[PDB]
Amino acid sequence: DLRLHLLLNTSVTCNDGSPAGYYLKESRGSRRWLLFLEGGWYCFNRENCDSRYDTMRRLMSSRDWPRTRTGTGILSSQPEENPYWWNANMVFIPYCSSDVWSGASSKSEKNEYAFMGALIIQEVVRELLGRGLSGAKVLLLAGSSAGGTGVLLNVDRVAEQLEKLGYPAIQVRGLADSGWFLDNKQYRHTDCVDTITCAPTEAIRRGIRYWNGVVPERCRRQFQEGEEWNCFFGYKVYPTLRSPVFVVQWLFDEAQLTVDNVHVQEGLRLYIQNLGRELRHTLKDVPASFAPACLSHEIIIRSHWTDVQVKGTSLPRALHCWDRSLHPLKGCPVHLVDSCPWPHCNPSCPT
Numbered sequence: 001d002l003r004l005h006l007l008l009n010t011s012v013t014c015n016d017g018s019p020a021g022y023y024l025k026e027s028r029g030s031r032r033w034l035l036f037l038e039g040g041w042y043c044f045n046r047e048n049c050d051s052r053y054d055t056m057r058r059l060m061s062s063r064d065w066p067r068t069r070t071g072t073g074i075l076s077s078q079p080e081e082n083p084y085w086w087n088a089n090m091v092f093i094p095y096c097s098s099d100v101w102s103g104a105s106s107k108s109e110k111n112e113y114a115f116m117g118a119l120i121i122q123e124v125v126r127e128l129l130g131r132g133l134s135g136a137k138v139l140l141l142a143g144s145s146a147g148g149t150g151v152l153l154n155v156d157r158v159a160e161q162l163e164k165l166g167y168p169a170i171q172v173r174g175l176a177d178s179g180w181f182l183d184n185k186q187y188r189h190t191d192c193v194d195t196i197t198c199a200p201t202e203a204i205r206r207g208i209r210y211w212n213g214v215v216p217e218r219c220r221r222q223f224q225e226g227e228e229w230n231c232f233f234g235y236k237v238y239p240t241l242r243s244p245v246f247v248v249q250w251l252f253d254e255a256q257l258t259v260d261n262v263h264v265q266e267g268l269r270l271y272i273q274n275l276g277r278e279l280r281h282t283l284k285d286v287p288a289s290f291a292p293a294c295l296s297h298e299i300i301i302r303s304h305w306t307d308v309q310v311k312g313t314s315l316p317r318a319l320h321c322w323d324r325s326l327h328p329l330k331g332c333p334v335h336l337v338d339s340c341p342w343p344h345c346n347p348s349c350p351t
């Protein structure tokens, strides 16, 4: 199992001021480190954060965290379940900041909650450097859903942080799972007046102000003050990133359809087919990517993540090919995007 460590710097906190932390497996044999970012939506004002604290408190507090966790999928240490990185050092960072891992604000007089997701990541990295990460050769920053978007926001900040601390030999990379969202046309429309009616662009715009959210500097320089919400969307922030990033995205992601107000007539058929085509287009020039034509959400820490295949290649294989490419390869591809246009036209889609 993975063992819990609460942060020694107790001023880096979850939403309610309790200390953040991380779960760690060690692997003295290995110089490879995997840091996984958990997902789970977000909140963007007092009222919907208060609701989250009553019925989703583990995503806002460490008071009730268990001592241990079992690694699954890419966090598993058994080769039978994890053909990719089963011998690596494993780290699971719980999502307890409700800020898509972007915040840098403390609980104070004027703030009922702390939003410190961006600071949680640097503090975990800092404390791991005394536990063997100083000798690493690859640091893979991974994440699912809101954690996948967090990879896109923080992967270059982790690189920068290690360069400034004097560790130029650690290769920082990113693996973003199910966090590649589109600010597309919704199937049905509502003005942003409450949680259920606010589109992602409007909700994130409010969240950034509420969290004191931070985005990558090169992306901020393009869109400039007040327009930082653009950098939460993968196809806009990805071209500004310098670290290598592998993008995993279902073509018909359930969270995307939810925020598009989709829950089949001709109008909805065309909408669903157009969504797959628009997602497929934004990945055209992403060299390392895995995008199956399925209706689902998340993959990389699911125990049966090895089942799905695109063009006959599994995700663990594609990630292995990505490793080899960073040392095209005969029979070991890294760009795998389905072209069939309906959910589950790939027979290997999860049931």
Ligand SMILES: COc1ccc(NC(=O)Nc2ccncc2)cc1
Residues within 6 Å of the ligand: 041, 042, 100, 145, 146, 149, 181, 200, 204, 232, 233, 255, 258, 259
């Ligand atoms: C662009 O940045 C992001 C956009 C969307 C999400 N996820 C999200 O909205 N999840 C959700 C779950 C349940 N009900 C409604 C919504 C995370 C980041």
Ligand SMILES: *[C@@H]1O[C@H](CO)[C@@H](O)[C@H](O)[C@H]1NC(C)=O
Residues within 6 Å of the ligand: 009, 011, 012, 119
């Ligand atoms: C704890 O973290 C905060 C925020 O990053 C930082 O300002 C402070 O210096 C840290 N404390 C110590 C003792 O390193």
